[PDB]
């Protein structure tokens, strides 16, 4: 009785401690992938920051010829605000 | 270890090589200033295949720019990743050929190819175990075709054991820039069939169609076209640079796709290619990549593959993927499109898997089909060549330089016997 | 350049999630949505309902049945073969 | 001794979902599958501290199946058993009998084969299906056919749900009932009918539940099955096996259709105000207010009856009560069966499941009888079958599946022959 | 597992489908941007039927928009839940048919329908087990009727073993928006009875009557009509998406309601439908739903059923209900009004219950009746067709395009035998 | 007692990369090399607290070998053992047998010699190779023939990977498989086939893994190898050495090609739910749903069977189970062997790997049989070899490498002779 019962108990314990490790392994792998994803996303956002500053510089140098302009160069109202700000800065200059 | 020497010829070759070394440098994570800045260990162990550590971490490409006009060199040097080449590798004549195959193969090569051979030799014994050479040039230009073809001949004369890739673009009548396209392309093909090991044929017509249909670009400049071709070349040699669950080097692909020694002209396709507005509206699965691969509207030649049969085909996959899905998809395409394949060769699909995806993507694929639909393109050229040569148009620009009429007749003969033997195996 | 720490074996590390061979407690049948994307995967663990719920009647009945558990019973009239018939046959003489 | 129970169709596995619930709640098994010997007839013990039921739920629409795969009993049931198709038969006997059956039943057979091989003292099978549908009728009959050719000599207790005369949910169920009965005749050894209108009336009057769903129906049906298998699980003063209904209840190899009943169906409050003894429930087992099939035995004559008793029951009063029944004349037997009763006594009372509205009774009776009112039911079904058939309505669906008029005509005349058989044995 | 591909044609189909996907996404808890924000686990199990996960929580609807003028496309992209459709599923011509069934079926169909077929093909092979198709269009217009009907014919000869629902609004004299309504309706119904499995007739007159009496709306714009139609479509396919005590799939409803292959025109109703002013004084039980279901002023067609007889009918209940109450209610409603039902079919009513109510209510229902009174609507349209066709009005715009006269006579003959056999079975 | 293992080709060392991982996990050896006598047959104990395996990896492409050199098992393998050339053979038997073999084989066998001199009680060699490739085939065959001339008498177990019929990764693999077999006939002693499609089907069907990769394949191949050498490693009730397969399964000097199988291949949930015993796994190890080679032995007749039982096994029930198999008629034997079995029992159960998918089982069975279904396989490969050789396709690679049509035609007729042999013996 004792031998067989303790063998069954030990086997249940080992199976449980195995299932938990498999689950934890999945958790760890998913977390690692998520870290990689966050890294790539942050990198792309950083690149977008630079492209936005460059667009701002182009708009600053375009502010001078305000009256002669094509149809769409203002992406949004905030861009209109920026162009008016640089216009007033030119007026100050 | 295994070494790939790069050789670029002509204006097309130079600008193609510029975008190529741009994307390889991004893959290995080296900055435009030449220093390593990558993250993974994997990017360190296989940069000797393409670079040489000089001193202070300067990794210079193992490439040789070659042309006859400095305009292309300056366009290369102007953009970023232009100051990473060794200026000793800028072997460069001074007169300029200008769309004359006789100039690029008899007059100017006689004083330039010696210096090119010196540079490519010194660049060859600088590394230990050569895998082969890799040439990017055109068949419409003069200094690209003629000089590059003569260089191919001299190299195959000296080093007969190393492999040889040639990415050559062919002219198309729908996108026809120069007038002597047939006169140049026919003579170049005549020499490529006997000297080169395999030629991966490209063209601009199919590229423009791809960016119209799939990419939906508004202004497809040469930058995007060179971007696609570079993505092709990185895909074809990802196996050496990165470990995978099944590796396939250059010679391995050559023996799996060339059933006959003169049957070595491939058509290429690259996947995935999707518009930016729809890039997030799609899945990324192996069946999805395979549907985009085997679409006839995705080959990089102006030859509809459904007008002929594939002799062999190859698919190099990049990314962490399940091999079972890889082979079952290959089995599906070998069974569903069963008529489009040759009968006297079962298992016409070679496959390979690399474990590192290209930068920015999760999983990509490269298709290299050796089909018999390429004879349509050679007939599409040879009919123009015969139209002129029946009538000695423009012939004196070549006659008065040393080239005789027998060269043109021989080029007609080899073109015709090639398309006839492709027609035979169809 | 100096590999003080050995490479972490990506070929085995990619199996459980990147190819999604591990099932998040799902039976070999159960044709349903697998949610093969990280945002959906992490949102699935925040589901308030968690499968069987008081919403569907077929689940709610079984839930109300197992609410208390197995209270108690007497095993007098339960038929015991262990008493009479499995007692005739024994295990190995030496012991196993 | 062991018996395996297979469930086919939407109604089958829902009844099983209540059935196995009651079983584990009787034998003290947690819903996860381990105890906190009478289980041996239903649950086989894998390893130690783990029990897996002898059953296969199978159906073609995966909705109700993966509802089971994801209910409370995910761990209790076993993964391979719960077979699921890909698309439903959709109330079409032919679609369930020829199109999809040919792909799914061979998997069911070599599954049930290794279930039998894991079993040791197999008493028989018992199948649960509703003939109104397409799955339970079509491939159910297909499975019974191939089971008969596989084993044959083993009993097959068929507890089927027949459509009610007036309360109905489908419109092609007369077609499905006729075609299924055409094969249930020569395959099923002992087939018990379980209508819905009768149980609805039981829940309406006795259980005083005015808004009952299918849950309460399946619960008390599961209660009857447990009361009927109690003799195999437990020891009593006088027990029967599953082969007993084979001999004691079927006089002719084609008259096997039994009227079932149960008593006392009593709520939790009426019992506190009422008295329980053997004589009144032996009476209450015969009145149609406690039957599971909407019919009138006053119009028919009984062939043979069976009486399972559970709980604190002595044999003297069950003997005296059946004596008073035989000497009474409100109900009459046939002239060819002088002794028309089959009694059985078991010690254990019926347990209750929490959430149900059945009281804890000291004793209970499960009656399974044979009569000719079933001949009246079959005639009423065949009449409304012929009404729709005279205009060739809905036939285009079956022949579009691949069947013809031949099996319709032969099933129609088969039930006519069964009608004549019932009338000639009744005389 | 079981799959529904959705197809919207013409202006009516696009606007209705727009409100349809809004109701569906709100039931499945997906926000208009395209990410999951629901709570219940029941909502995740059955989104494979209507959506595909692309990458990162983005669920794209399995729908195809098909038209000829971008005005409807912009009305789709402007409103909420508009940015979710895949831009490749916007297959789309440019010219415009404009109430010409010949333009919808012979000229523009020959170049648009191969394209939409390829999109539908890709969307169909993307899934595993097709249950059926769901097509919403109109019968008065040209770009919806003729194009959609040809699409139906092509699909029915392509996948013959799959179900197909079509929701079509039909013309009425009181709601006469275009002038060639009969010339379009008669040809469309002629093709639908031979291709479509079953149709559910709609019209604007009944919807306006519903908004007048039951809803008591002040300004019933098209948004509210499409809202009612959307609620019906969600109600019928609720069974595939949610479990219940008695599941009834699309094919199960078809076989329970269609006694003969040509008698597949149903009239539809929806309950509960009460004004917000009276929602406070009302009760919500099965009898209160039924005595609003079987009312003639709740049908969404201009066909008074008490002027005919019911062949079969079906009820789809949603919410935690007691089936005894459901069934005894169906028995009572069949016994009381016994004359209005056909006699040679017992148990004329199919019933089914699902255990998930729509959002905002505790219990709802959907009525689908196959009555014979629909012949009044067909007679009403065929008499207008006769009045025009005896005199050759408006005919030459159809004749001069490729269509001939015997097509019109054929449509007349088939309509006439159709109304003849409805009257016969009555 | 010692046995050394060599690994050839791209597939070989990936199999070894999973197999040695299993050995260290079985003997409790940490990957750095030290335990925190049964191990002696695989690890030799250098220094103090350090065991270094009796293995050799060798390949021509250095990319996968130095992937091992940088992997987790840096310190475990002696730096010299891992042989690696300069450049790949590239799916070319002639290139990997005549040009590059001539410089690599001498370094290999002049290593293996000093491995054998380190050893004392060498049972034999066991080789891991895939014949489809160029490296696995060319210098594989070259190594085998130079080992046979060096030792001769010692057994050489060859675990080869043949290409699937319909699943294929290469193109010239028929040429390579035929040219490799032409020497595998008369050089190796005991050769076990294992395919990839059969394993894919196994992992999809039983293991319910819908997207498997090569790693899962290599994991259960290691299970098979470990299960057939565990008799040497651990003491069982009835042990079996490597010389036994040499006699008990090879009745003819040129008929040595053994099908392999394994049971129970089972997932994590199904295993706990079901009741594993000896009878059902003895059955399951005989159905083609669990063989390592895609072929149906119902078409063939078993020449001999060998059954390794691991774990929870008493000899009685295995004896009874093989009896039921012999008295069944679903499979038949040749008329030549009345006693067509060889059993073998070991006590230690099979171990599990974290990240592995197979649940722990009390007992497992690895069957190694011999039949004529392999005779069907070779004819299948011979058919599509003659297809490509009729058109002289791909031949210029081999001749320009240095070979001729002579060995092409003679390997062709060699497989023809083997075909006549199998057809003659099967009668
Ligand atoms: N007593 C009872 N009867 C049920 C239950 N569920 C369904 N039924 C009956 O089953 C009959 C129809 O057959 P179903 O089981 O519902 O469907 P099916 O047999 O699986 O056939 P398909 O609909 O094609 O799947 C209906 O007339 C119901 O009366 C239930 O839970 N309890
Ligand atoms: N089961 C299994 N088979 C493999 C594995 N790796 C490669 N193969 C098989 O090997 C065959 C090709 O040979 P490879 O091992 O890839 O390459 P090789 O034998 O070393 O020959 P070379 O490519 O010239 O180096 C393919 O058909 C694969 O099926 C693996 O990890 N597991
Ligand atoms: N795709 C692509 N094609 C190019 C590029 N530059 C030139 N070409 C093609 O090359 C052909 C002319 O070759 P050319 O530059 O004159 O060669 P070269 O004169 O010998 O150097 C034209 O048909 C162009 O289409 C480029 O950057 N990208
Ligand atoms: N209920 C409703 N009906 C509409 C809507 N748009 C158009 N219709 C109906 O469509 C009919 C005319 O069909 P039409 O829209 O021209 O079809 P098309 O031109 O082929 O797209 C009219 O009778 C309208 O009642 C809408 O948004 N809601
Ligand atoms: Mg059903
Ligand atoms: Mg290899």
- Phi-psi region for residue F344, left (φ > 0), alpha (ψ -120 to 50) or beta? beta
Q: Find the B42 Cα to ligand 6 centroid distance in Å.
A: 20
The Cα of F376 is separated from the nearest Cα of chain C by a number of Å equal to 34
Collapsing DSSP to helix, strand or coil, E201 comes out as: strand
CB atoms within 10 A of CB F114: 10
Q: Considering every ligand atom shown, identify the ligand nearest to the alpha carbon of residue E244 and give its number.
A: 1
- Direct distance between the N- and C-terminal alpha carbons of chain E, in angstroms, rounded to an integer: 40
Give chain E's contact residues with C (Cβ, < 8 Å).
1, 35-36, 39-42, 44-48, 53, 55-57, 243-245, 320, 355-356
Pairing, β E59-61 against β E51-53? antiparallel
User: Cis omega (within 30 of 0) on the bond before B212?
Assistant: no
Nearest residue in chain E measured CA to CA from B285: E54
Surface-to-core class of residue D148, CB atoms within 10 Å of its CB (0-12 exposed, 13-18 middle, 19+ buried): middle
- Nearest ligand atom owner, CA of E8: 4
**Encoding tokens for residue D355?**
């959430």
Is the CB of B283 less than 8 angstroms away from the CB of E88? no
Q: Answer positive or negative: Cα dihedral of D133, D135, D139, D144.
A: negative
Residue B355 touches chain F, beta carbons under 8 Å: no
Instruction: Give the number of other CB atoms < 10 A from CB of residue D272.
Output: 9
Is residue E44 within 8 Å of C47, Cβ to Cβ?
A: yes
Per DSSP, the residues of E105-171 read: IIISHHHHHHHHHHHHHHHHHTSSEEEEEEEEEESSSSTTHHHHHHHHHHHHHHSTTSEEEEEEE--
Place of tokens 């169809």: B426
Q: Is the peptide bond before D264 cis (omega within 30 degrees of 0)?
A: yes
Residue D188 annotated as part of some ligand binding site: no
3 state DSSP class of B310:
strand
E287: CB partners within 8 A, 6+ apart: E325, E329
> Cβ neighbours of residue B401 under 8 Å, at least 6 residues apart?
B100, B102, B103, B106, B107
CB B85 within 8 A of CB B135: no
Provide residues of D within 8 Å CB-CB of chain A: 47-49
Q: What is the DSSP string of B366-393?
A: EEEEEESTHHHHHHHHHHHHHHHHTTTT
Coil/strand/helix, residue D83: strand
Size of interface B-C (CB pairs under 8 A): 12
Tally of CB atoms within 10 A around B420? 10
H or E, element range at F56: strand F55-59
Q: Contact D49/A12, CB-based, under 8 Å? A: yes
Query: Rounded to an integer, what distance in angstroms lies between the CA atom of residue D168 and that of residue D292?
Result: 16
Which of C17, C24, C42 minimises the CB distance to A29? C17
Which among B370, B5, B1, B369 has a CA at the least distance from the CA of B162? B5
E9 CB less than 6 Å from ligand 4? no
> Which tokens go with D117?
């091989």
Beta bridge partners of F158: F127, F191
CB of D395 closer than 6 A to ligand 1?
Answer: no
Q: Whose CA is nearest to atom 28 of ligand 4?
A: E222
Identify the helix (H) or strand (E) that includes residue B137.
Answer: strand B129-138
D84 part of contact set with chain E, CB < 8 Å:
no
DSSP letter at E77 equals H
Q: How many residues does this entry show for chain E? A: 426
Answer whether F204 touches B (CB < 8 Å): yes
Q: Is the peptide bond before F264 cis (omega within 30 degrees of 0)?
A: yes
Q: Is D89 in the pocket of ligand 1 (CB under 6 A)?
A: yes
Is residue D332 within 8 Å of D383, Cβ to Cβ? no
Distance CA C82, CA C80 (A): 5
CA distance F270 to chain D (A): 6
Which residue from B275, B283, B291 is facing E54, i.e. has the nearest CB?
B283
Q: Is residue C12 within 8 angstroms of chain B, CB to CB?
A: no
Number of Cβ within a 10 Å radius of residue D406? 8
Q: Parallel, antiparallel, or unpaired: how do β-strands D43-45 and D51-53 relate?
A: antiparallel
C7 CB near a chain B CB, below 8 Å? yes
User: What angle do the packed helices D214-233 and C57-65 form, to 10 degrees?
Assistant: 50
Burial B372-400 (b: 16+ CB within 10 A, else e): bbbbbbbebbbebbeebbeeeeeeeebee
Point out the residue among E243, E249, E312 whose CB comes nearest to the CB of D67: E243
Compute how many other C-beta atoms are within 10 angstroms of the C-beta atom of residue F66: 16
End-to-end CA distance of chain B: 40
Looking at the CA of residue E145, tell me the nearest atom of ligand 4: 20
C55 neighbors E359 (Cβ within 8 angstroms)? no
C23-30, long-range: CB within 8 Å, 24+ apart, which pairs? C24/A26, C27/D69, C27/D74, C27/D79, C27/D82, C27/F269, C28/D79, C28/D80, C28/F208, C28/F267, C28/F269, C28/F270, C29/D62, C29/D65, C29/D66, C29/D69, C29/D79, C29/D82, C29/D84, C30/D66, C30/D69, C30/D70
Q: What is the 3-state secondary structure (H, E, C) of E218-283?
A: CCCCHHHHHHHHHHHHHHHCHHHHCCCCECCCHHHHHHHHCCCCCCCEEEEEEECCCCCCCCCCCC
CB contact C14 to B (< 8 Å): yes
D152 secondary structure, DSSP code: -
Question: How distant is the Cα of C19 from the closest Cα of chain B, in angstroms?
Answer: 7
Alpha-carbon distance E250 to E238, whole Å?
10
- Whether B259 has its CB under 8 Å from any CB of chain F: the answer is yes
| CB neighbourhood size of C68 (10 A) | 11
User: Is E230 annotated in some ligand binding site?
Assistant: no
Q: Count CB neighbours of D216 within 10 A.
A: 24
CB atoms within 10 A of CB D378: 20
Chain C residue with CA closest to A30: the answer is C17
Q: Which of F274, F286, F330 to substitute to test the interface with D, most D CBs within 10 Å?
A: F274
The DSSP result for F188-238, as a single string, is -SEEEEE-SHHHHHHHHHTS--SS--HHHHHHHHHHHHHHHHHHHHS--SB
D123 Cβ inside 6 Å of ligand 1? no
Instruction: Check residue B38 and give left, alpha or beta (phi > 0: left; psi -120 to 50: alpha).
Output: beta
Q: How many CB atoms sit inside 10 A of residue D269's CB?
A: 11
Ligand 2 surroundings by CB, under 6 angstroms: B 246, 252; F 9-11, 14, 61, 88-91, 130, 132-136, 161, 163, 169-170, 196, 214, 217-218
Q: Are strands F363-370 and F304-311 parallel, antiparallel or unpaired?
A: antiparallel
- Nearest by CB to residue C51, choosing from E41, E320, E355, is E41
In chain D, how many H helices and how many E strands?
14, 12
What six digits make up the tokens of D384?
A: 């409304």
* Upstream peptide bond of E272 is cis (omega within 30 degrees of 0): yes
User: In the PDB record, what is the listed experimental method?
Assistant: cryo-EM
Catalytic annotation, residues of D: 244
How many angstroms separate the CA atoms of D173 and E283, rounded? 34
Q: Inter-chain contact C14–B245, Cβ cutoff 8 Å? A: no
* CA D192/CA D175 separation, integer angstroms: 20
Q: Which residue of A has its CA nearest to C22?
A: A26
Residue (of F58, D378, C14, A55) closest to B357 by Cα position: C14
Residue F342 burial by CB count (10 A; 0-12/13-18/19+): exposed, middle or buried?
middle
For residue D116, what are its two tokens? 């039998």
Q: Are D251 and D304 in contact (CB under 8 A)?
A: yes
Neighbours of C7 (CB within 10 A): 17
Pocket of ligand 3 (CB under 6 A): B 10-12, 15, 67, 99, 138, 140-144, 171, 177, 204, 222, 225-226
Exposed (0-12), middle (13-18) or buried (19+): which is B251, by Cβ within 10 Å? buried
D275 annotated ligand binder: no
What is the rounded CA–CA span in Å between residue F302 and residue F208? 30
Q: Specify the DSSP element, H or E, that contains B317.
A: strand B310-318
Contact D52 F280 (CB under 8 A): no
Question: Is E369 touching ligand 4 by the criterion CB < 6 Å?
Answer: no
Closest CA to D225 of D246, D194, D251, D253: D194
Instruction: Report the alpha-carbon distance of residue B35 to residue F100 in Å, rounded.
Output: 37
Which tokens hold the place of C18? 């990147």
- CB contact set of B165 (below 8 Å; sequence gap of 6+): B132, B133, B134, B135, B197, B198, B200, B236, B250
d(CA F130, ligand 2 centre) in Å: 6
Residue F173 Cα: closest atom of ligand 2: 27
Q: How far is the CA of F11 from the centre of ligand 6 (A)?
A: 7
Query: E-strand spans in E23-128?
Result: 51-53, 59-61, 63-66
Backbone angles phi, psi at B310, to 5 degrees: -80, 135
Minimum-distance ligand to the CA of D11?
A: 1
Q: Is B184 helix (H, G, I), strand (E, B) or coil?
A: helix
Min distance B385 CA to chain C CA atoms (Å): 54
Ligand 4 neighbour E142 (Cβ under 6 A)? yes
Contact E152, E191 (CB under 8 A): yes
Neighbours of D120 (CB within 10 A): 10
Residue of B39, B41, B357 to mutate, interface with C, max C Cβ within 10 Å: B41
Identify the residue among C20, C26, C45, C49 best suited for mutation to test binding to E, counting E beta carbons within 10 A and taking the highest.
C49
The answer, for E352 touching chain D at a CB cutoff of 8 Å, is yes
In 3D, which of F407, F132, F171 has the Cα closest to residue B259? F171
Alpha-carbon radius of gyration of chain B: 21
Identify which of D53, D79, D47, D55 has the alpha carbon closest to the alpha carbon of residue D66.
D79
Task: Please identify which of the residues F45, F197, F244, F419 carries the catalytic annotation.
Answer: F244
Q: How many CB atoms lie within 10 A of CB E402?
A: 11
Q: Do A30 and C22 touch (CB under 8 A)?
A: no
How far, in Å, CA of C20 to CA of C23, rounded? 7
CB contact under 8 A, F275 and D46: yes
Q: Which atom of ligand 4 is nearest to the CA of E146?
A: 20
Residue D354 DSSP label = T
- In chain D, the residue whose alpha carbon lies closest to the alpha carbon of E2 is D87
How close A8 gets to chain D, by Cα (Å)? 7
């Amino acid at each position: 009785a004792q031998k067989r019962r303790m063998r069954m108990a030990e086997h249940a314990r080992e199976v449980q401690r195995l299932i938990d490790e498999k689950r934890q392994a999945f958790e760890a792998a998913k977390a690692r992938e998520e870290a990689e994803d966050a890294a790539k996303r942050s990198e792309d956002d950083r690149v977008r920051g630079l492209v936005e500053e460059e667009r701002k510089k182009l708009l600053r140098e375009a502010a001078e010829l305000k009256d002669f302009l094509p149809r769409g160069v203002l992406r949004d109202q905030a861009d209109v605000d920026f162009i008016s700000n640089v216009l007033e800065e030119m007026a100050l200059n | 270890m295994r070494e790939i020497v790069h050789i670029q010829g002509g204006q097309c070759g130079n600008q193609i090589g510029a975008k190529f070394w741009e994307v390889v440098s991004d893959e290995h994570g080296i900055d435009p200033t030449g220093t390593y800045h990558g993250d993974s260990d994997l990017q360190l162990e296989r940069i000797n295949v393409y670079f040489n550590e000089a001193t202070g971490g300067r990794y210079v490409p193992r490439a040789i720019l070659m042309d006859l006009e400095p305009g292309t060199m300056d366009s290369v040097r102007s953009g970023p990743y232009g100051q990473i080449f060794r200026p000793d590798n800028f072997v460069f004549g001074q007169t300029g050929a200008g769309n004359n195959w006789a100039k690029g193969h008899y007059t100017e090569g006689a004083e330039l190819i010696d210096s090119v051979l010196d540079v490519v030799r010194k660049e060859a014994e600088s590394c230990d175990c050569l895998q082969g050479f890799q040439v990017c040039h055109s068949l419409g230009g003069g200094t690209g075709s003629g000089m590059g073809t003569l260089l191919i001949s001299k190299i195959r004369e000296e080093y007969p054991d190393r492999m040889m890739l040639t990415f050559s673009v062919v002219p198309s009548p729908k996108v026809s820039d120069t007038v002597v396209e047939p006169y140049n392309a026919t003579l170049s093909v005549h020499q490529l069939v006997e000297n080169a090991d395999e030629c991966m044929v490209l063209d601009n017509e199919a590229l423009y169609d791809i960016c119209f249909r799939t990419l939906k670009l508004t202004t497809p400049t040469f930058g995007d076209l060179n971007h696609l071709i570079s993505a092709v070349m990185s895909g074809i040699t990802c196996c050496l640079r990165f470990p995978g669950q099944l590796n396939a080097d250059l010679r391995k692909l050559a023996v799996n796709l060339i059933p006959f020694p003169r049957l070595h002209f491939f058509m290429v396709g690259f996947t995935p290619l999707t518009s930016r507005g729809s890039q997030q509206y799609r899945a990324l699965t192996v069946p999805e990549l395979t549907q985009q691969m085997w679409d006839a509207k995705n080959m990089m030649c102006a030859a509809d593959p459904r007008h002929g049969r594939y002799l062999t085909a190859s698919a190099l996959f990049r990314g962490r993927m399940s091999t079972k899905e890889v082979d079952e998809q290959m089995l599906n395409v070998q069974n569903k499109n069963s008529s489009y394949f040759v009968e006297w060769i079962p298992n016409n699909v070679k496959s390979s898997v690399c474990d590192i995806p290209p930068k920015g993507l999760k999983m990509s694929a490269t298709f290299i089909g050796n089909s018999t639909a390429i004879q349509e393109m050679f007939k599409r050229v040879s009919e123009q060549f015969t139209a002129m040569f029946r009538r000695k148009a423009f012939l004196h620009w070549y006659t008065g330089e040393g080239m005789d009429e027998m060269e043109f007749t021989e080029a007609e003969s080899n073109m015709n016997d090639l398309v006839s033997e492709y027609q035979q195996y169809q | 350049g100096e590999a003080a720490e050995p490479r972490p074996d990506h070929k085995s590390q990619a199996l459980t999630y990147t190819l999604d061979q591990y099932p998040r407690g799902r039976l070999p049948g159960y044709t349903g949505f697998k949610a093969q994307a990280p945002a959906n995967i992490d949102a699935g663990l925040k589901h308030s309902m968690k499968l069987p719920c008081h919403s569907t009647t077929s689940g709610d009945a079984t839930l109300r049945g197992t609410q208390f558990g197995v209270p108690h019973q007497d095993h007098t009239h339960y038929i015991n073969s262990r008493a009479g018939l499995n007692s005739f046959f024994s295990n190995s003489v030496v012991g196993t | 001794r062991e018996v395996i129970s297979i469930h086919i169709g939407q109604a089958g596995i829902q009844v099983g979902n209540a059935c196995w619930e009651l079983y584990c709640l009787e034998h003290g098994i947690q819903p996860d599958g381990q105890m906190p010997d009478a289980f041996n007839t239903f649950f086989s013990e894998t390893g130690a501290g783990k029990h897996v039921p002898r059953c296969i739920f199978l159906d073609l629409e995966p909705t109700v199946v993966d509802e089971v795969r994801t209910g409370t009993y995910r761990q209790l049931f076993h993964p391979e058993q719960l077979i699921s198709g890909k698309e439903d038969a959709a109330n079409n006997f032919a679609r369930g009998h020829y199109t999809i059956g040919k792909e799914i039943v061979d998997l069911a057979l070599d599954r049930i084969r290794k279930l039998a091989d894991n079993c040791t003292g197999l008493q028989g099978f018992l199948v649960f299906n509703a003939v109104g549908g397409g799955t339970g009728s079509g491939l159910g009959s297909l499975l019974l056919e191939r089971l008969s050719v596989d084993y044959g000599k083993k009993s097959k207790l068929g507890f089927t749900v027949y459509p009610s005369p007036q309360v109905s949910t489908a419109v092609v169920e007369p077609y499905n009932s006729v075609l299924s009965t055409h094969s249930l005749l020569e395959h099923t050894d002992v087939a018990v009918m379980l209508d819905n209108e009768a149980i609805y009336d039981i829940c309406r009057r006795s259980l005083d539940i005015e808004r009952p769903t299918y849950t309460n129906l399946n619960r008390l049906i599961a209660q009857v099955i447990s009361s009927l298998t109690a003799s195999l699980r437990f020891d009593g003063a006088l027990n029967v096996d599953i082969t007993e209904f084979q001999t004691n209840l079927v006089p002719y190899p084609r008259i096997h259709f039994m009227l079932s009943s149960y008593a006392p169906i009593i709520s939790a409050e009426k019992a506190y105000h009422e008295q329980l003894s053997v004589a009144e429930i032996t009476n209450a087992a015969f009145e149609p207010a406690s039957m599971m099939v909407k019919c009138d035995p006053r119009h028919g004559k009984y062939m043979a009856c069976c009486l399972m008793y559970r709980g604190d029951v002595v044999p003297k009063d069950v003997n005296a009560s059946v004596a008073t029944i035989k000497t009474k004349r409100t109900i009459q037997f046939v002239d060819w069966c002088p002794t028309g009763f089959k009694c059985g006594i078991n010690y254990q009372p019926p347990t209750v499941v929490p959430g149900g509205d059945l009281a804890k009774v000291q004793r209970a009776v499960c009656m399974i009888s044979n009569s000719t009112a079933i001949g009246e039911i079959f005639s009423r079904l065949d009449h409304k079958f012929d009404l729709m058939y005279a205009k060739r309505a809905f036939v285009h669906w079956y022949v579009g599946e691949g069947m013809e008029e031949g099996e319709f005509s032969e099933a129609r005349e088969d039930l006519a022959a069964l009608e004549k058989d019932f009338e000639e044995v009744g005389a």
